[PDB]
Amino acid sequence: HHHHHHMVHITLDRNTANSWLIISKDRRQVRMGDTHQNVSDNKERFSNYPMVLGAQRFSSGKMYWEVDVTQKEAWDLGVCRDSVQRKGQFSLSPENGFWTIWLWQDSYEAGTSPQTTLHIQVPPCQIGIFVDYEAGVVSFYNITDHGSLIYTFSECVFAGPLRPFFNVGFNYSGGNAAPLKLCPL
Ligand SMILES: O=C(Nc1ccc2ncccc2c1)c1ccccc1
């Protein structure tokens, strides 16, 4: 890819975070806390899962950002509609307003319905996410492997403004405490 020059400075939106998450002062890192984080409930917060949105909203143009996933066992990354469900249980699918990939139990999968197996030779430490709003495209790149393509969603029905989407995952195992980090441009 040659997508870096549509680089956008993403920050995390505290108000959207599940109440167990800890967002750094610079709003560029998020991790799972060991307890509910002494914040009020609000209608924006994801209730059931360790999810948070970026502050930025996109309705046009090309956008690119990078996320560090070093030492994590489980995570979801991508973009979602501003209008996605926040409360209760749901699946990650384009029908529900999500364009995502994830790591789960040593397999990488794209959040189609049903999910799609990914073929990655070099487990990634940093992921690039590219959105072309007008083209209807969301693409994922393996920064650890010279920017190699991971997956492309095409003909996307964004149906409204988009937000960067993050899930740090649970830490039942004790092996998934590490943060997601937005990488410098
Ligand atoms: O399994 C389901 N959703 C999720 C979503 C996010 C998760 N994040 C961390 C851990 C588990 C998660 C599970 C689901 C929900 C409804 C109907 C069918 C399936």
Three-state DSSP at 14 gives helix
Which residues sit opposite 30 in a β-bridge? 23, 180
Residue pair 79/129 in contact (Cβ under 8 Å)? The answer is yes
Three-state DSSP at 75 gives strand
Of 49, 73, 98, best ligand 1 pocket probe by most atoms within 8 Å of the beta carbon: 49
Structure determined by: X-ray
DSSP assignment letter at 175: S
Handedness of CA 138, 150, 47, 42 (dihedral sign): negative
Q: Distance between CA 97 and CA 29 in Å, rounded?
A: 24
Instruction: Find all residues with CB under 8 Å of 91, minimum gap 6, and list them.
Output: 111, 113
Copy the structure tokens of residue 142. 């393996």
* Ligand 1: residue whose CA is nearest its atom 4: 91
Of 47, 89, 105, 176, best ligand 1 pocket probe by most atoms within 8 Å of the beta carbon: 89
Q: Can the peptide bond before residue 114 be classed as cis, meaning omega within 30 degrees of 0?
A: yes
Q: Distance between CA 83 and CA 9 in Å, rounded?
A: 22
Residue pair 130/12 in contact (Cβ under 8 Å)? The answer is no
Q: Distance between CA 13 and CA 6 in Å, rounded?
A: 21
CA of 91 to the centre of ligand 1 (A): 5
Three-state DSSP at 145 gives helix
Residue pair 27/12 in contact (Cβ under 8 Å)? The answer is yes
* Ligand 1: residue whose CA is nearest its atom 6: 49
Closest CA to 180 of 99, 64, 49, 71: 71
Tell me the structure's resolution in angstroms, rounded to a single decimal.
1.4
Burial of 115 (0-12, 13-18, 19+ CB in 10 A): middle
Q: Distance between CA 172 and CA 176 in Å, rounded?
A: 8
Domain 4-182 -> CATH class: mainly beta
- Measure Cα distances from 162 to 61, 68, 174 in Å: 11, 21, 32
Q: 25 φ, ψ to 5°?
A: -55, -40
Q: Distance between CA 73 and CA 123 in Å, rounded?
A: 11
Q: Which atom of ligand 1 is nearest to the CA of 49?
A: 8
* Ligand 1: residue whose CA is nearest its atom 12: 49
Q: Distance between CA 160 and CA 176 in Å, rounded?
A: 33
Q: Distance between CA 139 and CA 78 in Å, rounded?
A: 9
Q: Distance between CA 90 and CA 98 in Å, rounded?
A: 11
Instruction: Find all residues with CB under 8 Å of 112, minimum gap 6, and list them.
Output: 93, 94
Instruction: Find all residues with CB under 8 Å of 128, minimum gap 6, and list them.
Output: 1, 3, 64, 65, 66, 140, 141, 142, 143, 147
Q: Distance between CA 93 and CA 146 in Å, rounded?
A: 28
**Strand 98-104's sheet: what is its strand order?**
51-53, 162-167, 75-81, 98-104, 107-110, 116-117
Residue pair 28/182 in contact (Cβ under 8 Å)? The answer is yes
Three-state DSSP at 176 gives coil
Measuring from each residue's beta carbon to the nearest atom of ligand 1, which residues come in under 6 Å?
49, 89-91, 167, 169-170
Residues in the chain: 185
